[PDB]
């Protein structure tokens, strides 16, 4: 079974959904984002000091 | 098996999406209706009953 959903990007707030087959018991799904990290690809150009 | 009062469960296999049949018991003719749903498995390992 292929299920699709869209969870808002907000850490610390759970996202609860349910998967209902036509004739089978519902399946509960919960996603809890504890941290969402965005890491850019950085390359060093130079270093400066006094 | 049959008792004085209660509920009895019967396992049946149907190909009807909306089944409605006349279940015959010791003497009565109960009318049974409902709705069925497509199964999980695309392919199984036994012939259809």
- C-beta contacts of A25-29 below 8 A and 24+ residues apart: A29/A3, A29/A5
Q: Minimal Cα–Cα distance from B30 to chain A, Å? A: 24
How many Cα neighbours within 13 Å face the side chain of A13?
4
Residues of chain A with C-beta less than 8 angstroms from the C-beta of B37: 21-24
Sign of CA dihedral B36, B42, B43, B44: negative
| Interface contact flag, B40 A24, Cβ < 8 Å | yes
Which of A 1-50 lie inside 8 A of B, CB atoms? 1, 21-24
Q: Name A31's Cβ contacts closer than 8 Å, sequence gap at least 6.
A: A7, A14, A15
Resolution (A): 3.2
Q: Which residues pair with B23 in a beta bridge?
A: B30
Closest CA to B9 of B32, B27, B28, B29: B32
Method: cryo-EM
Q: Provide the CA A17 distance to its chain's centre, in angstroms.
A: 14
Angle at B3 between CA B2 and CA B9, to 5 degrees: 55
């Amino acid at each position: 079974y292929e299920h699709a959903t869209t969870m808002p990007s907000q850490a610390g707030i759970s996202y609860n959904t349910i998967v209902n087959r036509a004739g089978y018991a519902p399946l509960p799904i919960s996603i809890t984002p504890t941290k969402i990290k965005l890491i850019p690809t950085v390359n060093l150009e130079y270093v400066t000091c006094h | 098996e049959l008792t004085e009062q209660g509920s009895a469960t019967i396992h049946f296999s149907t190909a009807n999406i909306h089944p409605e049949f006349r279940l015959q018991i010791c003497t009565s003719y109960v009318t049974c209706k409902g709705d069925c749903h497509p199964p999980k498995d695309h392919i199984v390992t036994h012939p259809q009953y």
